[PDB]
Amino acid sequence: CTIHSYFIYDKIEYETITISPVHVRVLKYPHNILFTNLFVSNVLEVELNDGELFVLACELINKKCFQEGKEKALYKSNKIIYHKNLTIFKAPFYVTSKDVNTECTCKFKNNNYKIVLKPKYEKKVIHGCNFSSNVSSKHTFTDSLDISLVDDSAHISCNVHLSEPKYNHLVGLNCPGDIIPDCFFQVYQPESEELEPSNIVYLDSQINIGDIEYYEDAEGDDKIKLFGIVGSIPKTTSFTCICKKDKKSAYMTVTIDS
Amino acid sequence: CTIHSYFIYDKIEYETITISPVHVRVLKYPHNILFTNLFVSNVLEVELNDGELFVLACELINKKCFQEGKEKALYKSNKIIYHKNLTIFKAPFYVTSKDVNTECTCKFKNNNYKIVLKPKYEKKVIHGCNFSSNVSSKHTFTDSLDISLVDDSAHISCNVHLSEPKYNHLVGLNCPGDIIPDCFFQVYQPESEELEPSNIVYLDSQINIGDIEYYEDAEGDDKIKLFGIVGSIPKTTSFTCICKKDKKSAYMTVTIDS
Amino acid sequence: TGDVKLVESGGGLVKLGGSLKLSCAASGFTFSSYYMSWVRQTPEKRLELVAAINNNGGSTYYPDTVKGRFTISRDNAKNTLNLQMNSLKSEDTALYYCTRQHYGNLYFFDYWGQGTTLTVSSSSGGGGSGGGGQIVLSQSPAILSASPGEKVTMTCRASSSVTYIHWYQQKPGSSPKPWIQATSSLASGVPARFSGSGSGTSYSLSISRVEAEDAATYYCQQWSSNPLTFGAGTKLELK
Amino acid sequence: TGDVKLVESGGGLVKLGGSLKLSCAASGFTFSSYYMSWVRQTPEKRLELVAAINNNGGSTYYPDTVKGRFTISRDNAKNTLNLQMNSLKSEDTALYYCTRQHYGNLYFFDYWGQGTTLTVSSSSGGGGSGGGGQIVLSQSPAILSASPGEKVTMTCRASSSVTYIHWYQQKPGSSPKPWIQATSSLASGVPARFSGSGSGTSYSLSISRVEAEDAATYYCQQWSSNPLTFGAGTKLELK
Ligand SMILES: *[C@@H]1O[C@H](CO[C@@H]2O[C@@H](C)[C@@H](O)[C@@H](O)[C@@H]2O)[C@@H](O)[C@H](O)[C@H]1NC(C)=O
Ligand SMILES: *[C@@H]1O[C@H](CO[C@@H]2O[C@@H](C)[C@@H](O)[C@@H](O)[C@@H]2O)[C@@H](O)[C@H](O)[C@H]1NC(C)=O
């Protein structure tokens, strides 16, 4: 095993070993960790950066915390670590809107300290293909190809190529029909130069990075699937995702250099 | 008149005035001029650069010269200047193949001096759209969109954007059907932000540059139209060209910054 | 769903000065990618642009004959086109077609609906309350009676320069149909005997060998400046 | 021209050891953008890949049962597919379909021709000289006799892991037709009562309410490693 990625109380501070933020190289967490020891009127408002961590040390949480918002807003984090009553919050790389927050209640002493986190919103385009035809959407894509414009029984590609020493982008698609395979948790291998098959594989195995954040959304019969990549990849990786609506089909090919 | 471009014996050495290479600013010719005064065995072989000039001073040419090749090759120049028996040759910016040459016969004294020019071939991609479906072609395009893949009665764009301080590129298309308008001598104006018409205009007026070289080719029912641009343009210019095959149509939009 | 379809609803009879709303249901295409228009056909068979709206619905145009009385609107989510017509005059009595153009097809009216009739109600006929402050199209002849197998030509003269002309063919009982796109590019299915040519103020449509199938009214149309205008039509006859 | 069409020619009767050339005429698509295959159907109704060629025609694959006897070729300029068959054996007696896949459709055989028959000529029937050094597909049951309005399920087991299965439906007198793409994505027009599921070595096709229209042979197909293989088929019956 050449396990080499970031570590946040994951299984192979330390206690088969957990790792706070066969060769198993441990990378020191690439982001800032914000620790709270348990502000104005028993509540604490905190702005988090994309990927920034927030750890709370509190042994009293009477119900599920940081799983709901303290206003008309749901700030969803993909990693809410619960261990030895030391909850861990990982700020996402994508969010539906700026008007979003999450709440946690820590019963410290005989007072309810409630934490509220907000995002330092940054307008982010998705490097990918929009195969839908609605001009109304909360998502912006680098490429577009309205699948309704393609002929029945035809197959057309929409290519996306990424070429940066270090990456920090969102890759995804918008499909008004069926997505093949279950993108982006599983992607379709690139085409061979020889007469060889192309299989469905997990994206994690193809890119070979840990905690690859995956995001999703839906706006009518339009499905949005996305994923975030932060850092340099070991090798130039390519993969595909198919969108298909009735007799029309279009496929997104993605090539990421390094 | 603010006539401001290159000059090669054109009408408004000097003799309403001709100009060897109302405000009329004369720009000194942006390329090297090669003069022959009239080599091995009464013939001269010369390699020319893209845009380089070659002037022959000879008062005796019994028939049309530099209009035909001295081998299985036709090296076509868009500007063959005939004035005061001082023929001028302007090397093109596009050529079908490397195996190409042109011949001229100068009756100097009592000996036939025959000039032969060849190109310093450089593999050049065309910034534009290939709407055809044949993999066999002598031309390479930056973008492709096989029009046979588009649905009947649908209209899809293929965009090309150029962004360089100084340009030296070929812009064009390959259409398997009808080209609208007569591209690239005349192009279709860009789309208005308001409810205003878009007209057919000459490309020369849109880009505002002199001697914009235009090239063409055909491979079966596939029509290739191209044009060359060398230098910085006064302002960010955009224009369109439509390709249409039966009920299918696709349009190339071109935006050139500066 | 299916192929392109435009269905006009509303219309009937309104007193002079009255109000009426017309609607158009678009199906079989991405509606939001097309410019939409209301184009009417007078009892004299003249074609006139009544209103036009851009793709997003933020820009509209109305000729001076309807400006301040009619209002064009679109609902891209419902795939609908609307026209609220106020202070109706006798001049407004026409068949109202719903039709589309795309910036990418050189603003060619490739699909037209069957039309919805409006009858607003002394006599009249001719002209059309238009012809002022616009490029006018003069077609000649008004009636071309030719013998089969003959080469025919009809002309379209423009009051001032137009950079292109579109030709449309209309047979009784049906709406106009695309015939010649951008001066010389024949529409899909149009026989090779047809040709289109011209520049400046003079354009033409020619048929190398006329047949029974060609008998129809051919209209030329320009859009080099607002408003967009059509000619009166050349009725091709083979008696 | 028109819609996708694949016409197979040649075939008839050849003595054992003889030679024969088959041809396929492709029309209605950009042929050079598709991978082409010759897939035969034994008298036992087994489907077997005979040969495959890539888009440019530079890469070919032949299973060990035909490798060294058959040769696949394509002429992208003529829109043709050829198969030269040498040293013909009794095992080669089958209906030869010409069919297509695209890398972009997950190599799904979306169009198949009607087939060309070859009769090379003691008795036999079963197996198919295949099943060696390949992922084998085991379908169960061979005959599913169900009553209308019943929920039915047919299974497709794979000798070793496959990352997806394609389902095809075949009714007597016609070639196989796309039914379920990439395990669970129904083909165009396929009723909502049909569903497909699975992973690893176990996959299935289910029908929520069986009807007279569903009566057909359903084949599963895998392409996770060379060669590409199909199962034997589950004949759906409603007597
Ligand atoms: C096109 O989209 C319209 C607006 O969508 C709404 O706003 C976006 C930003 C999302 O929040 C989405 O979930 C909302 O539905 C719809 O009203 C309209 O019906 C859509 N049109 C079609 C044909 O789907
Ligand atoms: C596709 O192209 C084939 C090869 O074209 C030939 O070579 C190119 C490089 C040009 O020189 C061209 O003028 C030549 O024709 C053709 O043989 C073939 O027929 C073409 N296919 C179709 C359907 O047009």
PDB file of C-alpha atoms in Angstrom, chain B residues 98-245:
ATOM      1  CA  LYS B  98       5.743  22.196 -49.578  1.00  0.00           C
ATOM      2  CA  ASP B  99       6.498  20.690 -53.063  1.00  0.00           C
ATOM      3  CA  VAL B 100       5.656  23.952 -54.917  1.00  0.00           C
ATOM      4  CA  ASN B 101       7.600  26.428 -57.176  1.00  0.00           C
ATOM      5  CA  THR B 102       7.077  29.313 -59.653  1.00  0.00           C
ATOM      6  CA  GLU B 103       9.038  30.303 -62.781  1.00  0.00           C
ATOM      7  CA  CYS B 104       9.802  33.570 -64.611  1.00  0.00           C
ATOM      8  CA  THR B 105      11.889  34.087 -67.800  1.00  0.00           C
ATOM      9  CA  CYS B 106      13.964  37.289 -68.143  1.00  0.00           C
ATOM     10  CA  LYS B 107      15.510  37.848 -71.602  1.00  0.00           C
ATOM     11  CA  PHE B 108      18.734  39.560 -70.449  1.00  0.00           C
ATOM     12  CA  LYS B 109      21.429  40.115 -73.144  1.00  0.00           C
ATOM     13  CA  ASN B 110      21.174  36.958 -75.387  1.00  0.00           C
ATOM     14  CA  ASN B 111      20.594  34.391 -72.567  1.00  0.00           C
ATOM     15  CA  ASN B 112      17.392  33.096 -70.852  1.00  0.00           C
ATOM     16  CA  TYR B 113      17.667  33.678 -67.086  1.00  0.00           C
ATOM     17  CA  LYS B 114      14.880  31.691 -65.419  1.00  0.00           C
ATOM     18  CA  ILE B 115      13.941  32.415 -61.764  1.00  0.00           C
ATOM     19  CA  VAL B 116      12.439  29.636 -59.544  1.00  0.00           C
ATOM     20  CA  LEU B 117      11.061  30.373 -56.010  1.00  0.00           C
ATOM     21  CA  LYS B 118      10.210  27.802 -53.277  1.00  0.00           C
ATOM     22  CA  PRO B 119       8.462  28.181 -49.852  1.00  0.00           C
ATOM     23  CA  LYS B 120      10.115  27.808 -46.432  1.00  0.00           C
ATOM     24  CA  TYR B 121       7.188  25.531 -45.500  1.00  0.00           C
ATOM     25  CA  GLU B 122       5.861  25.775 -41.933  1.00  0.00           C
ATOM     26  CA  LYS B 123       3.016  23.410 -40.833  1.00  0.00           C
ATOM     27  CA  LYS B 124       0.164  25.877 -40.164  1.00  0.00           C
ATOM     28  CA  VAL B 125      -3.135  25.169 -38.386  1.00  0.00           C
ATOM     29  CA  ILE B 126      -6.163  27.281 -39.365  1.00  0.00           C
ATOM     30  CA  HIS B 127      -7.945  29.026 -36.473  1.00  0.00           C
ATOM     31  CA  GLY B 128     -11.468  28.135 -37.504  1.00  0.00           C
ATOM     32  CA  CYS B 129     -14.156  25.515 -37.850  1.00  0.00           C
ATOM     33  CA  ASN B 130     -14.204  22.286 -39.849  1.00  0.00           C
ATOM     34  CA  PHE B 131     -17.861  21.477 -40.501  1.00  0.00           C
ATOM     35  CA  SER B 132     -17.004  18.591 -42.841  1.00  0.00           C
ATOM     36  CA  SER B 133     -16.770  14.904 -41.858  1.00  0.00           C
ATOM     37  CA  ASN B 134     -13.810  13.641 -43.967  1.00  0.00           C
ATOM     38  CA  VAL B 135     -10.699  12.678 -41.954  1.00  0.00           C
ATOM     39  CA  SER B 136      -8.678  13.017 -45.244  1.00  0.00           C
ATOM     40  CA  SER B 137      -7.763  16.677 -45.856  1.00  0.00           C
ATOM     41  CA  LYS B 138      -4.606  18.721 -46.441  1.00  0.00           C
ATOM     42  CA  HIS B 139      -5.896  21.377 -43.948  1.00  0.00           C
ATOM     43  CA  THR B 140      -5.798  21.351 -40.119  1.00  0.00           C
ATOM     44  CA  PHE B 141      -8.442  23.311 -38.151  1.00  0.00           C
ATOM     45  CA  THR B 142      -8.365  24.361 -34.475  1.00  0.00           C
ATOM     46  CA  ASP B 143     -12.069  23.552 -34.032  1.00  0.00           C
ATOM     47  CA  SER B 144     -14.362  20.925 -35.569  1.00  0.00           C
ATOM     48  CA  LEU B 145     -18.168  20.424 -35.609  1.00  0.00           C
ATOM     49  CA  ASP B 146     -19.419  17.855 -38.128  1.00  0.00           C
ATOM     50  CA  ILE B 147     -22.622  19.473 -39.476  1.00  0.00           C
ATOM     51  CA  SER B 148     -24.091  16.003 -40.198  1.00  0.00           C
ATOM     52  CA  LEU B 149     -24.360  15.610 -36.351  1.00  0.00           C
ATOM     53  CA  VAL B 150     -26.653  18.598 -35.982  1.00  0.00           C
ATOM     54  CA  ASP B 151     -30.438  18.143 -36.085  1.00  0.00           C
ATOM     55  CA  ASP B 152     -32.564  19.348 -39.048  1.00  0.00           C
ATOM     56  CA  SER B 153     -33.753  22.972 -38.634  1.00  0.00           C
ATOM     57  CA  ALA B 154     -31.224  23.591 -35.805  1.00  0.00           C
ATOM     58  CA  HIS B 155     -28.536  26.328 -35.670  1.00  0.00           C
ATOM     59  CA  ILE B 156     -25.360  25.854 -33.700  1.00  0.00           C
ATOM     60  CA  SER B 157     -22.331  28.141 -33.274  1.00  0.00           C
ATOM     61  CA  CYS B 158     -18.644  27.248 -33.351  1.00  0.00           C
ATOM     62  CA  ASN B 159     -16.667  30.109 -31.779  1.00  0.00           C
ATOM     63  CA  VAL B 160     -13.080  31.168 -32.488  1.00  0.00           C
ATOM     64  CA  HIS B 161     -11.378  33.821 -30.287  1.00  0.00           C
ATOM     65  CA  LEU B 162      -7.955  35.329 -31.058  1.00  0.00           C
ATOM     66  CA  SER B 163      -6.035  37.255 -28.342  1.00  0.00           C
ATOM     67  CA  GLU B 164      -2.446  38.256 -29.212  1.00  0.00           C
ATOM     68  CA  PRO B 165      -0.619  41.683 -29.105  1.00  0.00           C
ATOM     69  CA  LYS B 166       0.536  41.014 -32.713  1.00  0.00           C
ATOM     70  CA  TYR B 167      -1.185  38.446 -34.967  1.00  0.00           C
ATOM     71  CA  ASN B 168       0.181  36.080 -37.638  1.00  0.00           C
ATOM     72  CA  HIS B 169      -2.553  33.503 -38.119  1.00  0.00           C
ATOM     73  CA  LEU B 170      -4.919  31.986 -40.736  1.00  0.00           C
ATOM     74  CA  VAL B 171      -8.704  32.253 -40.023  1.00  0.00           C
ATOM     75  CA  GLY B 172     -11.115  30.108 -42.045  1.00  0.00           C
ATOM     76  CA  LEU B 173     -13.582  27.254 -42.367  1.00  0.00           C
ATOM     77  CA  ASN B 174     -14.410  24.031 -44.191  1.00  0.00           C
ATOM     78  CA  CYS B 175     -18.041  23.701 -45.267  1.00  0.00           C
ATOM     79  CA  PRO B 176     -19.564  20.637 -46.943  1.00  0.00           C
ATOM     80  CA  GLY B 177     -22.509  22.757 -48.205  1.00  0.00           C
ATOM     81  CA  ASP B 178     -23.379  26.422 -48.893  1.00  0.00           C
ATOM     82  CA  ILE B 179     -21.197  29.200 -47.412  1.00  0.00           C
ATOM     83  CA  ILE B 180     -23.080  32.411 -46.427  1.00  0.00           C
ATOM     84  CA  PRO B 181     -22.097  35.136 -47.247  1.00  0.00           C
ATOM     85  CA  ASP B 182     -19.186  34.974 -49.777  1.00  0.00           C
ATOM     86  CA  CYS B 183     -16.629  34.382 -46.973  1.00  0.00           C
ATOM     87  CA  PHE B 184     -14.073  35.666 -46.332  1.00  0.00           C
ATOM     88  CA  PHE B 185     -14.157  38.577 -48.893  1.00  0.00           C
ATOM     89  CA  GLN B 186     -17.504  39.452 -47.293  1.00  0.00           C
ATOM     90  CA  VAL B 187     -18.519  38.452 -43.768  1.00  0.00           C
ATOM     91  CA  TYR B 188     -21.758  38.640 -41.725  1.00  0.00           C
ATOM     92  CA  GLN B 189     -21.697  41.357 -39.010  1.00  0.00           C
ATOM     93  CA  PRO B 190     -21.822  40.286 -35.332  1.00  0.00           C
ATOM     94  CA  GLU B 191     -25.111  40.076 -33.409  1.00  0.00           C
ATOM     95  CA  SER B 192     -26.450  43.275 -31.821  1.00  0.00           C
ATOM     96  CA  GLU B 193     -27.295  43.504 -28.103  1.00  0.00           C
ATOM     97  CA  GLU B 194     -30.438  45.458 -29.219  1.00  0.00           C
ATOM     98  CA  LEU B 195     -33.127  44.492 -31.803  1.00  0.00           C
ATOM     99  CA  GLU B 196     -31.052  45.766 -34.717  1.00  0.00           C
ATOM    100  CA  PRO B 197     -30.167  44.132 -38.071  1.00  0.00           C
ATOM    101  CA  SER B 198     -26.845  42.462 -38.872  1.00  0.00           C
ATOM    102  CA  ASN B 199     -25.583  43.108 -42.435  1.00  0.00           C
ATOM    103  CA  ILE B 200     -23.278  41.504 -44.957  1.00  0.00           C
ATOM    104  CA  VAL B 201     -20.125  43.672 -45.137  1.00  0.00           C
ATOM    105  CA  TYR B 202     -16.670  43.404 -46.746  1.00  0.00           C
ATOM    106  CA  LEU B 203     -14.069  41.884 -44.376  1.00  0.00           C
ATOM    107  CA  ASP B 204     -11.601  44.685 -45.321  1.00  0.00           C
ATOM    108  CA  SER B 205     -13.927  47.313 -43.822  1.00  0.00           C
ATOM    109  CA  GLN B 206     -14.566  45.244 -40.672  1.00  0.00           C
ATOM    110  CA  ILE B 207     -10.862  44.516 -39.780  1.00  0.00           C
ATOM    111  CA  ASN B 208      -9.597  47.796 -41.420  1.00  0.00           C
ATOM    112  CA  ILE B 209      -6.264  46.355 -42.714  1.00  0.00           C
ATOM    113  CA  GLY B 210      -4.732  46.476 -46.227  1.00  0.00           C
ATOM    114  CA  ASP B 211      -3.773  43.526 -48.484  1.00  0.00           C
ATOM    115  CA  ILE B 212      -5.690  41.002 -46.291  1.00  0.00           C
ATOM    116  CA  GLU B 213      -4.678  37.847 -48.131  1.00  0.00           C
ATOM    117  CA  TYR B 214      -7.589  35.554 -48.972  1.00  0.00           C
ATOM    118  CA  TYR B 215      -7.185  31.892 -49.808  1.00  0.00           C
ATOM    119  CA  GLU B 216      -9.490  29.119 -50.979  1.00  0.00           C
ATOM    120  CA  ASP B 217      -9.537  25.367 -51.704  1.00  0.00           C
ATOM    121  CA  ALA B 218     -11.933  22.485 -52.498  1.00  0.00           C
ATOM    122  CA  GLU B 219     -11.766  18.781 -51.706  1.00  0.00           C
ATOM    123  CA  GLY B 220     -14.852  17.033 -53.097  1.00  0.00           C
ATOM    124  CA  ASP B 221     -18.087  18.766 -52.071  1.00  0.00           C
ATOM    125  CA  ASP B 222     -16.023  20.417 -49.227  1.00  0.00           C
ATOM    126  CA  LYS B 223     -15.231  24.101 -49.599  1.00  0.00           C
ATOM    127  CA  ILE B 224     -12.307  25.677 -47.719  1.00  0.00           C
ATOM    128  CA  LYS B 225     -12.210  29.537 -47.327  1.00  0.00           C
ATOM    129  CA  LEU B 226      -9.367  31.208 -45.432  1.00  0.00           C
ATOM    130  CA  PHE B 227      -7.686  34.578 -44.816  1.00  0.00           C
ATOM    131  CA  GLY B 228      -4.344  35.797 -43.345  1.00  0.00           C
ATOM    132  CA  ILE B 229      -3.822  38.566 -40.731  1.00  0.00           C
ATOM    133  CA  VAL B 230      -0.331  39.943 -39.844  1.00  0.00           C
ATOM    134  CA  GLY B 231       0.052  42.663 -37.157  1.00  0.00           C
ATOM    135  CA  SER B 232      -2.057  44.424 -34.501  1.00  0.00           C
ATOM    136  CA  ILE B 233      -5.581  45.564 -35.372  1.00  0.00           C
ATOM    137  CA  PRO B 234      -6.894  49.014 -34.323  1.00  0.00           C
ATOM    138  CA  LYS B 235      -9.845  47.582 -32.337  1.00  0.00           C
ATOM    139  CA  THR B 236     -11.461  44.322 -31.095  1.00  0.00           C
ATOM    140  CA  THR B 237     -13.318  43.074 -34.197  1.00  0.00           C
ATOM    141  CA  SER B 238     -15.950  40.313 -34.414  1.00  0.00           C
ATOM    142  CA  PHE B 239     -17.723  38.745 -37.448  1.00  0.00           C
ATOM    143  CA  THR B 240     -19.567  35.565 -38.637  1.00  0.00           C
ATOM    144  CA  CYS B 241     -19.733  33.028 -41.472  1.00  0.00           C
ATOM    145  CA  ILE B 242     -22.588  30.503 -41.994  1.00  0.00           C
ATOM    146  CA  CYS B 243     -22.236  26.914 -43.233  1.00  0.00           C
ATOM    147  CA  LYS B 244     -25.444  25.121 -44.308  1.00  0.00           C
ATOM    148  CA  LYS B 245     -25.994  21.569 -45.693  1.00  0.00           C
TER     149      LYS B 245
END
